[PDB]
Design a protein around this ligand. Structure first.
Ligand SMILES: [Zn+2]
Ligand SMILES: [Zn+2]
Length: 264
């Protein structure tokens, strides 16, 4: 199987590996990329993987050690790809939520395709078709999402944690900011006051929770204002792995933004 660290990384892999091999995901639905430790079984999957796909040591730190033991030919380290490095944004150091950038997802698919052709020469024609089919579906999805989000450009909102910058930059969304950088370090009152002052003063439309975290501080901030409440899921928990799952993921996230931000 191809073993992907996070579900959306899995979505990209499953486009390319479709009809070739299985895709498995390490991080369970509900879990956070910022607060996880590998299970004994997670470890076994890694050693036995045909290919491991992950963002890199500044993202899934919980995977760095077991991945370091594998052949270079059996891993894609997304953040370290030559075509990805020029695309990194500071938004230290650089923001590592790379699976929300279509352009990086493209570079990821190319790397996956390239590695799997070497490892599985029996599936070269299928892998080639899968890559073509992935690019076509992604290009259509980018057109669709760009349209869905266009009216929303310029509306301020806050997100729970700093996960969305690549997507927001791509499609012209204009976040006022985020509650947390690391979503485990709960934000203090300081702070929650600064956010609500921004909300009112800058006339924000939305605040967004995330299903991986209890929404209390988000609801608290919105309380006594006209700001609407929504939810974004940077990990696509309700989407199943499969050929068109990455496109479905981007479309779902866009719909989650629009659901709250619509109605000017
Ligand atoms: Zn994150
Ligand atoms: Zn910040």
């Amino acid at each position: 199987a191809v073993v992907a660290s996070l579900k959306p990384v899995g979505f990209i892999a499953s486009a390319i590996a479709d009809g070739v091999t299985e895709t498995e995901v390490l991080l369970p639905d509900g879990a956070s990329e910022h607060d996880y430790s590998l299970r004994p079984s997670d470890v076994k999957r890694l050693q036995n993987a045909d290919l491991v796909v992950w963002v890199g040591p500044e993202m899934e730190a919980f995977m760095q050690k077991p991945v370091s033991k594998l052949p270079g030919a059996k891993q894609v380290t997304i953040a370290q790809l030559e075509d990805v490095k020029p695309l990194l944004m500071k938004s230290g150091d650089f923001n590592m939520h790379l699976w929300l950038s279509p352009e990086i997802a493209r570079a990821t698919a190319v790397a996956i395709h390239g590695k799997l052709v070497e490892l599985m020469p029996q599936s070269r024609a299928k892998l080639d078709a899968n890559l073509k089919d992935f690019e076509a579906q992604l290009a259509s999805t980018e057109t669709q999402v760009g349209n869905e989000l266009a009216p929303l450009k310029g509306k301020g909102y806050f997100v729970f944690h700093d996960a969305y910058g690549y997507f927001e930059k791509q499609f012209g969304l204009t976040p006022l900011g985020h509650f947390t950088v690391n979503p485990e370090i709960q934000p203090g009152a300081q702070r929650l006051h600064e956010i609500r002052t921004q909300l009112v003063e800058q006339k924000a439309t939305c605040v967004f929770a995330e299903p991986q975290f209890r929404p209390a501080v988000v609801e608290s901030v919105a309380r006594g204002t006209s700001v609407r409440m929504g939810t974004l899921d940077p990990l696509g928990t309700n989407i199943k792995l499969g050929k068109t799952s990455y496109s479905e993921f981007l479309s779902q996230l866009a719909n989650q933004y629009a659901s709250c931000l619509k109605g000017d």
